[PDB]
Amino acid sequence: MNPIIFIIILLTIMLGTIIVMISSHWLLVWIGFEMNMLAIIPIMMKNHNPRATEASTKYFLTQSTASMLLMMAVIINLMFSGQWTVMKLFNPMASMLMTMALAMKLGMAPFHFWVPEVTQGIPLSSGLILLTWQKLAPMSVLYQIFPSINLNLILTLSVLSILIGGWGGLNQTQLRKIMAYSSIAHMGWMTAVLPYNPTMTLLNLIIYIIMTSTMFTMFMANSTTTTLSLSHTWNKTPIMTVLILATLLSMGGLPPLSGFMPKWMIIQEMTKNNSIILPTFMAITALLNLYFYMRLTYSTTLTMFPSTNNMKMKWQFPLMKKMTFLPTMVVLSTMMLPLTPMLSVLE
Amino acid sequence: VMKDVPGWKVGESVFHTTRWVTPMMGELYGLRASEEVLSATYGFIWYT
Amino acid sequence: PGIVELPSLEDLKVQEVKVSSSVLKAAAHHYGAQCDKPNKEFMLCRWEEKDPRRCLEEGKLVNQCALEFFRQIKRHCAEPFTEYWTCIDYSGLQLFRRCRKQQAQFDECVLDKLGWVRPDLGDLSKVTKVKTDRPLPENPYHSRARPEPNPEVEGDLKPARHGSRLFFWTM
Amino acid sequence: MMLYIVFILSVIFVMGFVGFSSKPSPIYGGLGLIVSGGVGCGIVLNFGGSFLGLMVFLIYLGGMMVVFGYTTAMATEQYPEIWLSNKAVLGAFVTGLLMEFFMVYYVLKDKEVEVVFEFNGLGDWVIYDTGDSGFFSEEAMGIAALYSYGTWLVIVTGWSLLIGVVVIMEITRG
Amino acid sequence: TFQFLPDEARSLPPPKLTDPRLAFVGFLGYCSGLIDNAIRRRPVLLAGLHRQLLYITSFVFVGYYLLKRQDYMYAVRDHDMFSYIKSHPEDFPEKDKKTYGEVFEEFHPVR
Amino acid sequence: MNLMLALLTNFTLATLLVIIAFWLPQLNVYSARLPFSMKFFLVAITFLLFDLEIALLLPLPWASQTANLNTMLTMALFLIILLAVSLAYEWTQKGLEWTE
Amino acid sequence: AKTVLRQYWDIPEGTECHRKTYATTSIGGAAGLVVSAYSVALKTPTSFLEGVARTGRYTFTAAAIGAIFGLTSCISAQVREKPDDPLNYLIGGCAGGLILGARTRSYGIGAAACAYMGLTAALVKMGQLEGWQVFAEPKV
Amino acid sequence: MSMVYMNIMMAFTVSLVGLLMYRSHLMSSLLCLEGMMLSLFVMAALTILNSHFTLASMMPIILLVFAACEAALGLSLLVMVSNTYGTDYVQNLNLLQC
Amino acid sequence: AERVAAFLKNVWAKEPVLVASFAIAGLAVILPTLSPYTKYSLMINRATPYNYPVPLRDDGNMPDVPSHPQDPQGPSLEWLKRL
Amino acid sequence: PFFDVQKRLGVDLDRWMTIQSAEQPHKIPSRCHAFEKEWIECAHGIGSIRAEKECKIEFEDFRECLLRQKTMKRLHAIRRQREKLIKEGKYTPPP
Ligand SMILES: CCCCCCCCCCCCO[C@@H]1O[C@H](CO)[C@@H](O[C@H]2O[C@H](CO)[C@@H](O)[C@H](O)[C@H]2O)[C@H](O)[C@H]1O
Ligand SMILES: CCCCCCCCCCCCO[C@@H]1O[C@H](CO)[C@@H](O[C@H]2O[C@H](CO)[C@@H](O)[C@H](O)[C@H]2O)[C@H](O)[C@H]1O
Ligand SMILES: CCCCCCCCCCCCO[C@@H]1O[C@H](CO)[C@@H](O[C@H]2O[C@H](CO)[C@@H](O)[C@H](O)[C@H]2O)[C@H](O)[C@H]1O
Numbered sequence A: 001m002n003p004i005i006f007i008i009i010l011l012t013i014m015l016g017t018i019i020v021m022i023s024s025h026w027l028l029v030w031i032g033f034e035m036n037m038l039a040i041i042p043i044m045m046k047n048h049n050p051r052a053t054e055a056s057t058k059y060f061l062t063q064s065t066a067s068m069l070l071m072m073a074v075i076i077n078l079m080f081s082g083q084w085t086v087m088k089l090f091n092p093m094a095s096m097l098m099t100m101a102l103a104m105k106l107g108m109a110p111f112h113f114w115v116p117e118v119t120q121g122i123p124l125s126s127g128l129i130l131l132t133w134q135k136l137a138p139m140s141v142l143y144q145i146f147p148s149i150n151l152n153l154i155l156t157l158s159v160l161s162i163l164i165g166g167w168g169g170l171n172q173t174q175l176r177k178i179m180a181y182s183s184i185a186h187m188g189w190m191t192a193v194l195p196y197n198p199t200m201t202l203l204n205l206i207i208y209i210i211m212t213s214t215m216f217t218m219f220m221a222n223s224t225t226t227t228l229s230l231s232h233t234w235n236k237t238p239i240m241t242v243l244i245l246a247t248l249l250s251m252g253g254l255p256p257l258s259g260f261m262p263k264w265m266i267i268q269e270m271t272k273n274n275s276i277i278l279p280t281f282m283a284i285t286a287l288l289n290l291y292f293y294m295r296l297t298y299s300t301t302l303t304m305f306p307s308t309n310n311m312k313m314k315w316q317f318p319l320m321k322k323m324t325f326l327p328t329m330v331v332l333s334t335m336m337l338p339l340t341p342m343l344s345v346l347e
Numbered sequence B: 001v002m003k004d005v006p007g008w009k010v011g012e013s014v015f016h017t018t019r020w021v022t023p024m025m026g027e028l029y030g031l032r033a034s035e036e037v038l039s040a041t042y043g044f045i046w047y048t
Numbered sequence C: 001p002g003i004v005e006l007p008s009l010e011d012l013k014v015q016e017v018k019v020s021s022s023v024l025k026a027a028a029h030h031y032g033a034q035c036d037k038p039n040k041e042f043m044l045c046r047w048e049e050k051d052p053r054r055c056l057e058e059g060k061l062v063n064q065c066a067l068e069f070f071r072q073i074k075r076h077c078a079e080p081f082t083e084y085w086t087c088i089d090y091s092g093l094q095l096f097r098r099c100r101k102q103q104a105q106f107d108e109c110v111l112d113k114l115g116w117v118r119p120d121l122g123d124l125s126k127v128t129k130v131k132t133d134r135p136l137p138e139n140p141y142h143s144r145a146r147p148e149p150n151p152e153v154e155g156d157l158k159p160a161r162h163g164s165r166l167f168f169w170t171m
Numbered sequence D: 001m002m003l004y005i006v007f008i009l010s011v012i013f014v015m016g017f018v019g020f021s022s023k024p025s026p027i028y029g030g031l032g033l034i035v036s037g038g039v040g041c042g043i044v045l046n047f048g049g050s051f052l053g054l055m056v057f058l059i060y061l062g063g064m065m066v067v068f069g070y071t072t073a074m075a076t077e078q079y080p081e082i083w084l085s086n087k088a089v090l091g092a093f094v095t096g097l098l099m100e101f102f103m104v105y106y107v108l109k110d111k112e113v114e115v116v117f118e119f120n121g122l123g124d125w126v127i128y129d130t131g132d133s134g135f136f137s138e139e140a141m142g143i144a145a146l147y148s149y150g151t152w153l154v155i156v157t158g159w160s161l162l163i164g165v166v167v168i169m170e171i172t173r174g
Numbered sequence E: 001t002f003q004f005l006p007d008e009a010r011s012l013p014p015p016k017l018t019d020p021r022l023a024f025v026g027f028l029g030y031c032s033g034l035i036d037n038a039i040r041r042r043p044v045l046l047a048g049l050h051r052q053l054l055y056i057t058s059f060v061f062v063g064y065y066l067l068k069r070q071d072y073m074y075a076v077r078d079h080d081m082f083s084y085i086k087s088h089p090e091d092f093p094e095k096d097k098k099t100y101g102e103v104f105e106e107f108h109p110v111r
Numbered sequence F: 001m002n003l004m005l006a007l008l009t010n011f012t013l014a015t016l017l018v019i020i021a022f023w024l025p026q027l028n029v030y031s032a033r034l035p036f037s038m039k040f041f042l043v044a045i046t047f048l049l050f051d052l053e054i055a056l057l058l059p060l061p062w063a064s065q066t067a068n069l070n071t072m073l074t075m076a077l078f079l080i081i082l083l084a085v086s087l088a089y090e091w092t093q094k095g096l097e098w099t100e
Numbered sequence G: 001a002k003t004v005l006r007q008y009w010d011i012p013e014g015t016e017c018h019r020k021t022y023a024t025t026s027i028g029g030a031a032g033l034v035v036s037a038y039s040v041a042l043k044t045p046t047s048f049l050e051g052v053a054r055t056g057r058y059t060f061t062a063a064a065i066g067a068i069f070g071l072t073s074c075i076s077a078q079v080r081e082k083p084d085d086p087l088n089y090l091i092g093g094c095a096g097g098l099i100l101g102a103r104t105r106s107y108g109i110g111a112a113a114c115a116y117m118g119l120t121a122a123l124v125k126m127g128q129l130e131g132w133q134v135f136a137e138p139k140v
Numbered sequence H: 001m002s003m004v005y006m007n008i009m010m011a012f013t014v015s016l017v018g019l020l021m022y023r024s025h026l027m028s029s030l031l032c033l034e035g036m037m038l039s040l041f042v043m044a045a046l047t048i049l050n051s052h053f054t055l056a057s058m059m060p061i062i063l064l065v066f067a068a069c070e071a072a073l074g075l076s077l078l079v080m081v082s083n084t085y086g087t088d089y090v091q092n093l094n095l096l097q098c
Numbered sequence I: 001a002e003r004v005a006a007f008l009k010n011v012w013a014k015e016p017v018l019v020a021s022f023a024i025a026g027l028a029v030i031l032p033t034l035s036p037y038t039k040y041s042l043m044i045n046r047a048t049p050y051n052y053p054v055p056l057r058d059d060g061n062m063p064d065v066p067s068h069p070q071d072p073q074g075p076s077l078e079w080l081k082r083l
Numbered sequence J: 001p002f003f004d005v006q007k008r009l010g011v012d013l014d015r016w017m018t019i020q021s022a023e024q025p026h027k028i029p030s031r032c033h034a035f036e037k038e039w040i041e042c043a044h045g046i047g048s049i050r051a052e053k054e055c056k057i058e059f060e061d062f063r064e065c066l067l068r069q070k071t072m073k074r075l076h077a078i079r080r081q082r083e084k085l086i087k088e089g090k091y092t093p094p095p
């Protein structure tokens, strides 16, 4: 890609998301998703190979189907209320269709199958956009329509994603697939608390984005896409292994790290609503994620895996990748727990 | 026609408000011949 | 819900203006000048009451003014007017610009024998003012009382008592 | 009767959808969608959507569906498989066709029907508007307003079409 | 509406520049500076002091305003809560308090 | 009704002409990819995208009747310029070339 | 699903066993059908008959568990004269677990299923008595 | 609801079931996607026209324009798939299974 | 400037079609702002009465509102007649 | 909107098309303009939790204008009864 075109396409991805976030009209929300989907396909395809073409096609079919269902919900809503204002929907069938459409876009279980396959088939930088920035637009719609969402449907979607995400990651050696299943599980926490306190949804989304960006950036710095490749980091950039260890323990939700905060506050909000079984089930199920985060730490930082002779040639050259914002992102990913009350800015 | 339908009140509004409401096509031509109804509904759309 | 009140078939009866649309088009410009006052009184009623049942009397006066208008054309200018609206009636679009000669004969006849002056371009599209003894409606929409606004919040903003109060945090 | 013209068109609309949705050869599927598009325009025309109806013909049929057939002839099918020769297509086609007929039979017999949801069956003419004597097309006034009220719609729509060109050139360069 | 710090927030005292939370934010900025040196294999403590200074300053600057919004949002929460309690006295009756001499509690021996 | 009659007459006649054209007395007793070319695909797609912009311009004769002519003229030109930019981009990226 | 669960919890415990066994068997059958549907869609059977055999195998296996739980738990409440007792559900839950071991022909799965499903049923009874909420309505 | 909405809602459901029950050709699933748009265009137009929502008269056109652009993107992906394997069969798009 | 004229002669010789296109497109953008007649387009469009002019209830304090269409008060189209 | 940029800047990006009782070209009103207006004015500023209960009358009337279900049902009843009587020859309709 021409560097100027790449910039304009990146800005269009952002503009489509921004349109969804500033719109009060349902048509403009739909347009924002359409524009956003159009601009993201070229960065899935940029490396031109059958795997990237399959991922782009699987992605296109899922998102196009979800956008058709969204437009149905909008039109049904118009028929029964005569208006387009972005807010609660005025028809339960419309609410189910929009909820299902937004669940499909977020890759929530049982509409999750595309996330591991699309992420695996695209470059790390494109996967970074797919699993972080692309969550913003659908989550911002859910933030506004949650009063009319069926509680049983949304909590069922959340519980399934936490189970599927947790179990799916156990069988993975590909880093992009580990991140994909990790993403699915984290979406479940975000939607489980949405009916009770959307602010906590925003907190979880922001922190998840920060830790997810950190991990993708650290994978990109070393061009690592598999567990075994990542296991060579100790013999090249020992500092990177320590940063990876700290970030993974944070994504595992271990105190005193930043990733404990969203799980901590979601459990609080659910208990205030006399929800005890569900948060307890979620917290215990999230141990599945901790298991396969811990597995990565064993092969990356806490043990030294076998190396190769040609690795010595790498010792003579420095890292030249941008690693933009990595020092800031890693510190926020791990050291933010003492500032937890700052979540009120999101109110 | 609705003289001996139990509970029926003749000319009862379906709206809560007492404001005048413009009748729709079926309210005016509901009981009239099909030729007139066709002209009132599709005559303009179908004209040449 | 209640009963829609409808006027009886007899209260609706009135003498009709049973002339075709080319006749009305031909006479429209003098008709607007001559019958403006009952016409504007009727249109004010309709847009203020928003109810056809409330302006039947004014609607009947509109008909009477038009009938008297066309009785004065018949008495004095029947032949020039007939040539004029027949000229209009021939056109599929009933165009004024195809009938300027005949319009001139009719215009000169009414001015001579009735003092009628054709309003100029732009006149009949003016917003005029009408004097009506009819009382201005109070609640034309038949609105219910609006719900009471939520209790407003007033006072001085002070710091949060002991800060966030979040678990163990002291600020 | 002609008073049910919109309903009759809607019935044909569904059969055309069952046509391509059972997915015969894409050549025939494209034909079924074209027939549904034309019938869909007719439904819109009978509600006063003259300009909207003709856009389906000009853009949906004359533009999008032409490109679909062009691409099918070039990258999908060059010779159609005999229609309904496949068992699943024939079964799906028959299954949908029977469902539509059972719907249509009952609504016409009772002048109503409950297929999941309640639908009146008196004829769509009953809901039409009873007063219209303006000197303009309301649909035309609304569409023309795109350039006065819809500045923001024009900007985002025009931008997306430009990005469409840029994106498609990137996709296909390979 | 869509305002980070509305004008009514100016009636609140500003956070002190020696706030312990603000100092921690500054420390986080310092840590980021060292991690920047480490990932690029520079001398961790000495390299690029101009860069290390901006890391601290940027964190403190952004941290100060985030703390200001944090405190204002909690002041608004208390303001809303107290106004609602005043508006609805019937839902927050002043409790009749008895002394432990009058209150009966069961005794549970530990034997 | 008239337009429906006209359409039915035109195509009914066309059917009949095809019929007799195929059956007159004779008096005798005895799905791959078609050598796919990417350039022709891009012509069709380019036509589609330009056709959608034409759909947006078709209202212009009515839009000129607005009192908001300042806004209307600016948006009309903006749309056409963006169409020109699309053509300029395709042109300079060799999208209008038939060689190679 | 809300209609069957309404029927089951409407009947008093330890009474009308046949009605209780029907509600749980139908509930078990539904779960079996749901499992079969996903199984057949995501794991294509080799033939039409193999797909039908699998659907019946899962569906009967699930209805067998639902029947035994309902019957055993309703008899325990009747025999013991202890309606509002979680132990009846624990007995019914373990019985269903053993069936799974038999249908899956295994001893470890049966033992594991007896304990996990037995505890789950007992927890379900406690939540019914104490009004535990799984999907709690937002209140604050 | 009015009688027409039954069939228009049915048409969307038929095309949605068609889209979700793939066969072999990827083109066939794209046609069902455009069928869904068509039924959405008709239902939206009917609602807007019947209610005399004047400014909303442009909405079906915007829907048509954006959906045609989405279809153009989908067709481009189909030809790239066809160039890779020689057909538009969806059974070939299974590399990311592993 | 001289470099500007040399550039224009070059394109005029090699690409007169594109030169004409850009010149016409430039005039279309610029000339409306320089034309003394563009103001009448706004006035004529506003002067076309599509809907009925609803009369005002006379409160006795509207000396600028005509009572009859042929009274002098109100907008005049004499500027349009002479156009 | 998630971020209410429009209100912050005072710019109208898409509010103009959100409701049918807003300003329209040439003051062309929607069929349910009066019902939408009443419902909007009833519900304004009190929040959807309160409005769902307190503006139910205006909203039910508005929904009747939108889809006309009760009106069609009433017409269905009168027509169905008329067909019965004519089938029994007990009613002759006037011209
Ligand atoms: C890549 C993006 C490209 C965007 C291109 C946009 C180009 C726009 C160029 C012209 C825009 C304004 O064009 C024209 O300017 C004159 C300035 O006097 C305006 O003003 C003129 O008309 C108005 C009526 O509204 C009168 O009140 C005014 O007296 C008259 O001078 C016109 O109303 C406007 O039609
Ligand atoms: C390893 C453990 C795995 C997780 C275990 C989770 C256990 C969760 C406990 C089950 C949920 C609580 O159980 C549920 O409680 C409520 C409380 O009235 C009951 O609610 C019922 O109330 C009345 C009867 O009192 C019924 O008429 C009504 O149909 C129903 O709403 C449910 O019928 C019951 O199913
Ligand atoms: C990513 C792209 C970045 C570029 C962003 C460009 C944003 C451009 C926003 C255009 C809309 C500006 O703001 C809006 O403009 C138009 C006139 O121009 C005004 O609209 C005006 O004309 C029409 C006709 O009645 C009506 O909307 C309204 O009566 C009137 O206000 C709006 O009152 C104003 O709120």
Ligand SMILES: N=C(N)NC(=N)NCCc1ccc(I)c(Cl)c1
Residues within 6 Å of the ligand: A196, A197, A198, A199, A344, A347, E073, E074, E076, E077, G140
């Ligand atoms: N929907 C929810 N349950 N949560 C929620 N945001 N409640 C509103 C209560 C609240 C809490 C903290 C603050 I600071 C403020 Cl200002 C207001």
